[PDB]
RNA sequence: GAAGCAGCCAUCAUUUAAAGAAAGCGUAAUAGCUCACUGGUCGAGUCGGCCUGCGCGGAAGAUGUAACGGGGCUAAACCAU
């Protein structure tokens, strides 16, 4: 998945949730939107 | 399979009008008994009444060349009793039959009304997929054949007229011309006509690929001579070279391939066209430099002192000397001098000098854009 | 908020045993079904297991709703049981059940023979469906995931192990 | 959203009137289709949006106050999303039969299915 | 009937009739029924008028009296009876092809009020007006 | 880009940045953008920042530009030793003190003016904040 | 196999509780499966920002821990008293 300094978001079905030291981007509708870092 | 062919007009079994289906196994290999009965049953239900004691006729399955037995053809005879002495006319091919030869049993004298038999001893190679008819006399079947040669000359003049009026030009309309030529001989004459069409199918407009001199059978002296005369790749299917081709090949070793599978041939013509293809597209800056303080020199006329403002400057690359979106002067980077000495390369924030042969046109505050050009090599698909 | 602040029900003939901080419910099926507890206070009150924050902690409601969901699921586990059918999409795939192992052939040369814990049991209506029922939602869900692990869903053709509720998420083959 | 105390006042005087009369509706919706209600609507196109409207009015916690004492027989609401109608000629009028023949496909509960006098 | 799972659906007015290939594998799965043109569209004509767009729904079932998806001629009968092609404008357009009025065009297909949902009259005119902005018959304020 | 038309002189002293900015009030915009930090604002920056929000609303509204690049900055070539006279003229800079209103903007809705400065903000090099017109 | 979600155009309104000629998966396309919007149910807090205090990520290097002096500490830190 993507790594970027900013989370930035994409769509309303992107949840935007922390795991440990690492934010993830979890999108039910779209794995293309997947990210970590933040 | 039964349901999916019940979505089409194939006459499906029971739900449709009944082309009968049989369920048997050929990939694994388990009989097939039922299928053999079904094939017989359809042929018994059909009316197959045929002359067994009269005259002979039929079609040519596949034709090829033998180098001890001559041009030959495998001919299925529809109408019974092709005899030992009969005169035959197939299209533009004629002759009295010398002998008849078969793979179920070697020596054939009088044939059935449903069997393929090889014929041998003919004038040229008879076309596959059309009609052989026995005839009254040999002399008359010269005269018909010479009329059919007149017909092939009518088809020759038709194919000669067509190419000029389709696009005005003899060949290529636009100035960016590229072509590939090939010289092709397949062993089977039905094959040579079919796969040559598929090699002219795949072409793009920019690089055009074309057949010159399609052959049947072994490579010969004159076949190698055509690709020596005008550059082309010389290929043959199961076809291979003979001694009089080898004599030309050992002198000038043209592109010579005797082959494996047709897909690799269709790939290698595409590869040849791709190598043929014109190669470059990308134009991208390396550096930008500002001019100040002109000097004069007998080497180049004027010398523009420069300071490179951005990017890298290299000895030979194209340049654009510009002020405010006009190109003031044009060139290729001629002289790169730093401080007092000509040097291979210079990077931004550095004093430079440059002058170009027949440059005397310096204006301070003009800008040089030096730019890199990068090849890409397009590939046909 | 709201459900972490709610007492959870005791349907009689459950064990409802508490001994230190373990909570051990056997009931209407199964055995054991034991959880161990931390900073969630809890009061048995006949028809409920009533919860609250324990002494000096900052995790009131946030530990408690965990315990709320746990002792709920233990009561549901001893009564109803958990999960559903694994279906086999992808032609030629086959499930063979035995009391120890769910064996699958998912295109692999070696047979998988996947072993099943005793608090769960499994079933074959068909050679393609595998149904299972059992004591605990955490353990049965992990077993379904271990089965799902062998051939994961793929959006090109959907081959491998589904649960029959996840998205197909179809992606077109781009020869175009 | 809505402040209940000021909002309910305007509604009840018009809404309550249908219940008081000779007959009142209790039409419902669940696993059917709205396109069939738009079928009953193109029937109500004939009467210009009055008699056969099958009005999916269904509020109870912002509206339909209990001040008249005979209106709560037909005004209960829940699952099976509720709809009203309009009645004037009365005495088992033949206007109903056009609504009636569509009941083959079901479209849940309808007027006088609850067995009241 | 009670099944809408698989069918094929077309517009079949005048010489316009049929989206291009019903003789392909789209309709070649099906069994046969004659009735449904004569059952479904053909109900509503003499209660309304002539100059109506014509949709159709093709399917087959055991009782031979199956459930119509489209109940009716498509709404903009007021435009389509008056002008254009029988299915409609005969071309998509922003502008150019016509105009809509409030002095003489109201009453032309007044009978389609009986099987249009479009109810009392001032909203019934506006409901066909947006359809006519689709078709192209736009008029300045 | 942008530069003064005629020299008082062709080079300048470094100077200092103590004290908060004088120009902190919105003149002509409904909205604008004010600088929280301080720093050097290039002529490439002011060119870029105007270009982006112009493109976004295409031609809607009107902008004012309070900032101006007043003084030059000089810079040394790579090869030269220290000393040997002051560097040559290289670019033009708008030096700003903290609290300076950089841009102002009027003829758009509120959120679109917020977007326009959000877009412009990444072209700007230092910390900024959004402003509303108000009174004395 | 198009009737909102493969295309192109209209860039609007109707019927209407409420529903934009409809945002997605889905269907061969509708439907299926929902959103937007509201009814029933349940039950009190609910939603988005702003100013400041202290953290988290952004954080990859060269002989061996190797950027609290070390052990080691959640007070043996930090802030205020």
Does chain F touch chain B (at least 3 C-beta pairs within 8 Å)? yes
Q: Which residues lie across from A17 on neighbouring strands? A: A24
Name D99's Cβ contacts closer than 8 Å, sequence gap at least 6.
D40, D43, D52, D54, D110
Residues 36-65 of D with CB under 8 A from E: 38-39, 41-42, 44-46, 48-49
19-78 on E, CB < 7 Å from strand G: 19-22, 24-27, 29-30, 55-57, 69-70, 75
Are B328 and B359 spatial neighbours (Cβ–Cβ below 8 Å)?
Answer: no
Distance CA B300, CA B355 (A): 6
Distance CA B186, CA B197 (A): 13
**Helices and strands (H, E) in chain E, number of each type:** 3, 2
- What's the number of domains chain F is made of? 1
**CATH 3.90.930.12 for the C8-80 domain, yes or no:** yes
Retrieve residue E16's tokens: 């316009």
C-alpha distance from B350 to closest chain F C-alpha (Å): 6
CB contact under 8 A, F78 and B339: no
Architecture of domain E72-141: Orthogonal Bundle (1.10)
Q: Is A6 annotated as a binding residue?
A: no
CA of C38 vs C1' of G72, distance in Å? 29
Q: Is A35 annotated as a binding residue?
A: no
- Does F44 fall in a domain? yes
Distance CA B373, CA B367 (A): 19
Q: Is A38 annotated as a binding residue?
A: no
E46, E122, E123, E112: which is closest to E80 by C-alpha?
E112
Q: Which residues lie across from F89 on neighbouring strands? A: F74
- Does F99 fall in a domain? yes
B105 in contact with chain F, both atoms CB, cutoff 8 A:
no
B65, B191, B56, B190: which is closest to B125 by C-alpha?
B65
CA of A37 vs C1' of G66, distance in Å? 28
Nearest nt (C1') from E76 Cα = G14
The SS3 of residue D21 is: coil
- Does F12 fall in a domain? no
Give this entry's resolution in angstroms: 4.0
- Does F119 fall in a domain? yes
Name B46's Cβ contacts closer than 8 Å, sequence gap at least 6.
none
CATH number at residue F135: 3.90.1170.10
Retrieve residue C74's tokens: 């233990």
C-alpha distance from D57 to closest chain E C-alpha (Å): 18
Q: Could you check whether the bond before residue B32 is cis, i.e. omega within 30 degrees of 0?
A: yes
The SS3 of residue E36 is: helix
> Nearest 5°: phi and psi at B119?
-100, 145
Distance CA B160, CA B150 (A): 15
> Nearest 5°: phi and psi at E125?
-70, -45
CB contact under 8 A, D39 and E114: no
DSSP A14: B
Asked if domains C8-80 and C86-162 share a fold, the reply is: yes
Distance CA B234, CA B256 (A): 5
Question: How deeply is E23 buried, as exposed, middle or buried, from its count of CB atoms within 10 A (0-12, 13-18, 19+)?
Answer: exposed
Name B374's Cβ contacts closer than 8 Å, sequence gap at least 6.
B280, B282, B283, B284
Name B119's Cβ contacts closer than 8 Å, sequence gap at least 6.
B72, B73, B74, B75, B88, B97, B100, B101
For strand G, the positions having any atom within 7 A of a protein Cβ are: 1-3, 8-19, 21, 24-31, 38-41, 43, 45-46, 51, 56-58
Please report how many Cα atoms fall inside a 13 Å half-sphere around the Cα of residue E132, on the Cβ side: 24
Q: How many CB pairs under 8 A join B and F?
A: 9
Distance CA F21, CA F99 (A): 5
Question: Cα angle at E80 between E77 and E84, to 5 degrees?
Answer: 175
Domain boundaries, chain C: 8-80, 86-162
Distance CA C137, CA C120 (A): 10
List the CATH code of the domain at E1-71. Answer: 3.30.1550.10
Distance CA C48, CA E35 (A): 65
Going by DSSP bridges, is the β-strand pair C114-115/E55-58 parallel, antiparallel, or unpaired? unpaired
Q: Which of D39, D48, D105 sits opposite E119 (nearest CB)?
A: D48
Question: How deeply is B312 buried, as exposed, middle or buried, from its count of CB atoms within 10 A (0-12, 13-18, 19+)?
Answer: middle
Does chain E touch chain B (at least 3 C-beta pairs within 8 Å)? yes
14-33 on A, CB < 7 Å from strand G: 21, 29
Question: Of all protein residues, which has its CA closest to the C1' atom of G10?
Answer: E134
Question: Which positions in chain D touch E44 (Cβ < 8 Å)?
Answer: none
Name F126's Cβ contacts closer than 8 Å, sequence gap at least 6.
F35, F36, F37, F38, F39, F41
Q: HEC profile for chain B?
A: CCCHHHHCCCCCCCCCCCCCCCCCECCCCECCHHHHHHHHHHHHHCCCCCCCCCCCEEEEEEEEEECCCEEEEEEEEEECCCCCCCEEEECCEEEECCEEECCCCCEECCCCCCEEEEEECCCCCCCCCCEEEEECCHHHHHHHHHHHHHHHHHHHHHHHHHHHHCCCCCCCCCCCCEEEEEEEEECCHHHHHHHHHHHHHCCCCCEEEEECCCEECCECHHHHHHHHHCCCEEEECCCCECHHHHHHHHHCCCCEEECCCHHHHHHHHHHHHHHHCCCEEEEEEEEEEEECCCEEECCCEEEEEEEEEEEEEECCCEEEEEECCEEEEEEECCCCEECCEECCEEECCCEEEECCCCECCCCCCCEEEEEEEEECCCCCC
11-70 on D, CB < 7 Å from strand G: 34, 37-38, 41-42, 44-45, 49, 53-62
**CATH 3.90.930.12 for the C86-162 domain, yes or no:** yes
Domain that includes residue F68, residue range: 21-136
CB contact under 8 A, D39 and E71: yes
C163, C137, C142, C110: which is closest to C30 by C-alpha?
C137
- Does F71 fall in a domain? yes
D66, D88, D82: which is closest to D114 by C-alpha?
D82
Q: Is A33 annotated as a binding residue?
A: yes
Please report how many Cα atoms fall inside a 13 Å half-sphere around the Cα of residue D59, on the Cβ side: 13
Cα torsion through E63, E65, E67, E70, rounded to 10: 160
Residues 335-354 of B with CB under 8 A from F: 339, 349-351
Are B265 and B235 spatial neighbours (Cβ–Cβ below 8 Å)?
Answer: yes
Q: HEC profile for B95-147?
A: EECCEEECCCCCEECCCCCCEEEEEECCCCCCCCCCEEEEECCHHHHHHHHHH
Retrieve residue C119's tokens: 């608090």
Q: Which residues lie across from F33 on neighbouring strands? A: F103, F130
B311, B312, B315: which is closest to B354 by C-alpha?
B315
Question: Cα angle at B54 between B52 and B57, to 5 degrees?
Answer: 85
Asked whether residue D78, judged by its CB, lies under 7 Å from any atom of the DNA or RNA strand G, the reply is: yes
Asked whether residue D74, judged by its CB, lies under 7 Å from any atom of the DNA or RNA strand G, the reply is: no
CB contact under 8 A, B9 and E29: no
Chain B residues interacting with chain E (CB cutoff of 8 angstroms): 6-9
Distance CA B197, CA B234 (A): 17
DSSP E12: -
B307 in contact with chain F, both atoms CB, cutoff 8 A:
yes
């Amino acid at each position: 998945m993507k790594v970027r300094a900013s989370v930035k978001k994409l769509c309303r079905n992107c949840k935007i949730v922390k795991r440990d030291g690492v934010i993830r981007v979890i999108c039910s509708a779209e794995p293309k939107h997947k990210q970590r870092q933040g | 399979v039964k349901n999916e062919l019940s979505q089409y007009g194939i006459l499906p079994e029971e739900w449709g009008g009944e082309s009968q289906f049989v369920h048997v196994s050929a990939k694994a290999g388990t009989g097939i008994d039922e299928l053999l009965d079904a094939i017989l049953l359809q042929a018994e239900v059909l009316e197959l009444k045929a002359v067994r004691k009269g005259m002979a006729s039929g079609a040519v399955i596949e034709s090829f060349l033998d180098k001890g037995r001559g041009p030959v053809a495998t001919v299925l005879v529809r109408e019974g009793t092709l005899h030992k002495g009969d005169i035959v006319l197939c299209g533009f091919e004629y002759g009295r039959v010398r002998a008849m030869r078969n793979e179920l049993g070697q020596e054939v004298l009088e044939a059935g009304p449903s069997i393929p038999v090889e014929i041998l001893g003919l004038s040229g190679v008879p076309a596959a997929g059309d009609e052989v008819t026995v005839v009254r006399d040999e002399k008359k079947a010269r005269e018909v054949a010479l009329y059919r040669q007149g017909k092939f000359r009518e088809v020759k003049l038709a194919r000669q007229q067509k190419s000029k009026l389709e696009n005005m030009f003899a060949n290529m309309t636009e100035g960016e011309v590229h072509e590939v030529n090939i010289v092709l001989k397949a062993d089977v004459q039905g094959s040579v006509e079919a796969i040559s069409d598929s090699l002219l199918k795949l072409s793009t407009d920019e690089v055009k690929v074309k057949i010159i001199g399609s052959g049947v059978g072994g490579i010969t002296e004159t076949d190698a001579t055509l690709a020596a005369a005008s550059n082309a790749i010389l290929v043959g299917f199961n076809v291979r070279a003979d001694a009089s081709a080898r004599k030309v090949i050992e002198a000038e070793s043209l592109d010579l391939r005797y082959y494996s599978v047709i897909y690799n041939l269709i790939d290698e013509v595409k590869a040849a066209m791709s190598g043929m293809l014109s190669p470059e597209l990308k134009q991208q800056i390396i550096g930008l430099a500002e001019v100040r303080d002109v000097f004069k020199s007998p080497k180049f006329g004027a010398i523009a002192g420069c300071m490179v403002t951005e990017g890298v400057v290299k000895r030979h690359n194209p340049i654009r000397v510009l002020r405010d979106n006009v190109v003031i002067y044009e060139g290729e980077l001629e002289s790169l001098r730093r401080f007092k000495d000509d040097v291979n390369e210079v990077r931004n924030g550095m004093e430079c000098g440059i002058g170009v042969k027949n440059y005397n046109d310096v204006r301070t505050g003009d800008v040089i854009e030096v730019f890199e050009i990068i090849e890409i090599q397009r590939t046909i698909a | 908020s709201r459900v972490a602040k709610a007492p959870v029900v005791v349907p009689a003939g459950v064990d409802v045993k508490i001994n230190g901080q373990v909570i051990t419910i056997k009931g209407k099926n199964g055995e054991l079904t034991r959880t161990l507890n931390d900073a969630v206070e809890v009061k048995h009150a006949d028809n409920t297991l009533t919860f609250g924050p324990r002494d000096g902690y900052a995790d009131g409601w946030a530990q408690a709703g965990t315990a709320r969901a746990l002792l709920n699921s233990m009561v549901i586990g001893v009564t109803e049981g958990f999960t559903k059918k694994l279906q086999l999409v992808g032609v030629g795939y086959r499930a063979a059940v035995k009391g120890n192992v769910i064996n699958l052939s998912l295109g692999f040369s070696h047979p998988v023979d996947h072993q099943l814990p005793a608090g769960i049991t499994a079933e074959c209506p068909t050679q393609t469906e595998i149904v299972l029922k059992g004591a605990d939602k955490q353990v049965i869900g992990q077993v379904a995931a271990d089965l799902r692990a062998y051939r994961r869903p793929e959006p090109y053709k959907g081959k491998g192990v589904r649960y029959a509720d996840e998205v197909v998420r179809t992606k077109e083959a781009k020869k175009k | 959203m809505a402040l209940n105390l000021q909002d309910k006042q305007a509604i009840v005087a018009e809404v309550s009137e249908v219940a008081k009369g000779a007959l009142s509706a209790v039409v419902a919706d669940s696993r059917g289709v709205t396109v069939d209600k738009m079928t009953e609507l193109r029937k109500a196109g004939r009467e210009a949006g009055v008699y056969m409207r099958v009005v999916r009015n269904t509020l109870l916690r912002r509206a339909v106050e209990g001040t008249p004492f005979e209106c709560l027989k037909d005004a209960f609401v829940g699952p099976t999303l509720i709809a009203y109608s309009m009645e004037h000629p009365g005495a088992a009028a033949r206007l109903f039969k056009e609504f009636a023949k569509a009941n083959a496909k079901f479209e849940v509960k309808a007027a006088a299915f609850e067995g009241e006098l | 009937a009670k099944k809408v799972q698989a069918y094929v659906k077309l517009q079949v007015a005048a010489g316009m009739a049929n989206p291009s290939p019903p003789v392909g594998p789209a309709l070649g799965q099906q069994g046969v029924n004659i009735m449904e043109f004569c059952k479904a569209f053909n109900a509503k004509t003499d209660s309304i008028e002539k100059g109506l767009p014509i949709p159709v729904v093709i399917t087959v079932y055991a009782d031979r009296s199956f459930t119509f998806v489209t109940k009716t001629p498509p709404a903009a009968v007021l435009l389509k009876k008056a002008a254009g092609i029988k299915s409609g404008s005969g071309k998509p357009n922003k502008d150019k092809v016509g105009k809509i009025s409030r002095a003489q065009l109201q009453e032309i297909a007044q009978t389609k009020a009986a099987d249009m949902t479009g109810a009392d009259i001032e909203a019934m005119t506006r409901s066909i007006e947006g359809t006519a902005r689709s078709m192209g018959l736009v008029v300045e304020d | 880009m942008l530069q003064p038309k005629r020299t008082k002189f062709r080079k300048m002293h470094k100077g200092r940045n103590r004290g908060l900015a004088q120009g902190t009030d919105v003149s002509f915009g409904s909205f604008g953008l004010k600088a929280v930090g301080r720093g050097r604002l290039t002529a490439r920056q002011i060119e870029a920042a105007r270009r982006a929000m112009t493109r976004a609303v295409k031609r809607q509204g009107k902008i004012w530009i309070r900032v101006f690049p007043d003084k030059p900055i000089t810079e040394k070539p790579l090869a030269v030793r220290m000393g040997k006279g002051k560097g040559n003229v290289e670019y033009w800079v708008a030096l700003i003190q903290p609290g300076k209103v950089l841009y102002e903007m009027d003829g758009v809705p509120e959120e679109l003016a917020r977007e326009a400065f959000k877009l412009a903000a990444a072209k700007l090099p230092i910390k900024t904040t959004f402003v509303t017109k108000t009174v004395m």
